[PDB]
Write a protein that binds this ligand. Structure first.
Ligand SMILES: *[C@@H]1O[C@H](CO)[C@@H](O[C@@H]2O[C@H](CO)[C@@H](O)[C@H](O)[C@H]2NC(C)=O)[C@H](O)[C@H]1NC(C)=O
Ligand SMILES: *[C@@H]1O[C@H](CO)[C@@H](O)[C@H](O)[C@H]1NC(C)=O
Ligand SMILES: *[C@@H]1O[C@H](CO)[C@@H](O)[C@H](O)[C@H]1NC(C)=O
Lengths: 105, 99
């Protein structure tokens, strides 16, 4: 159904056959990043739920795999499994908690 | 020497044409497909080739079949050893059996 990620398609009639018009989605402009498998926060390994960890040199974010949309790393979009001693390439970073600003207010 | 088979085939008007692509060009195409698949993943078949580490690509592959991606990162050495043993088993089975 077309070269790329298939989106929608249309038929058209023709003599002795049919013609399809395949609408597809293709990525356009990419840029390099530095990535990590997990993040070690006070002895807990955090993995992304639906996404991938990225870095703009100094700060760490989590974003979609098919579109660059940075978000703050939070326990809402990450889940905890195991320790920091088994994952190869786990980095040290902090994980934001949503209850902290709403507990003091 | 003696009478061959293709030579008597040729002498009676039967001609075999060479293929358009040689074997080294097919090997170059196969090498390009391997170099795309190992490095970029499935991204090179849908546009521009975007690099990714192979552990994170294999985590995407495990996440596609319904297994959580933490199973890879806690069993990476075992999975690499199993893949290497399977590749060696295919090599030995091709070297031994000719059928
Ligand atoms: C990486 O991303 C961070 C987060 O967006 C950037 O930090 C912001 O930079 C702007 C411009 O200087 C400031 O106005 C904001 O206050 C910064 N936010 C924070 C939370 O620090 C950062 O500039 C980006 N680039 C680098 C090289 O770190
Ligand atoms: C990423 O880095 C490589 C080598 O450092 C460079 O050739 C390339 O232009 C960079 N950008 C992209 C989008 O690949
Ligand atoms: C991350 O922090 C731990 C303890 O806080 C430390 O042992 C480890 O070396 C740190 N990682 C790096 C890459 O420095």
């Amino acid at each position: 159904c077309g070269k790329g990620y298939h989106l929608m398609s249309f038929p058209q009639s023709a003599p002795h056959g049919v013609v399809f018009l395949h609408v597809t989605y293709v990525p356009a402009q990419e840029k390099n990043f530095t990535t990590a498998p997990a993040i070690c926060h006070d002895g807990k390994a955090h993995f992304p739920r639906e996404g991938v960890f990225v870095s703009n040199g100094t700060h760490w974010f989590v974003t979609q795999r098919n579109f660059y949309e940075p978000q703050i790393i939070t326990t809402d979009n990450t889940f905890v499994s195991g320790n920091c001693d088994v994952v190869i390439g786990i980095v040290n970073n902090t994980v934001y908690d949503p209850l902290q600003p709403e507990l003091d207010s | 020497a003696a009478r061959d088979l293709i030579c008597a085939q040729k002498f009676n008007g039967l001609t075999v044409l060479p293929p358009l692509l040689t074997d080294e060009m097919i090997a170059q195409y196969t090498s390009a497909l391997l170099a795309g698949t190992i490095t970029s993943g499935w991204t090179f078949g849908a546009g521009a080739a975007l690099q990714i580490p192979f552990a994170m690509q294999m985590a995407y592959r495990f996440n596609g079949i319904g297994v959580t991606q933490n199973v890879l990162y806690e069993n990476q050495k075992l999975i690499a050893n199993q893949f290497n043993s399977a590749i060696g088993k295919i090599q030995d089975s091709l070297s031994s059996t000719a059928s």
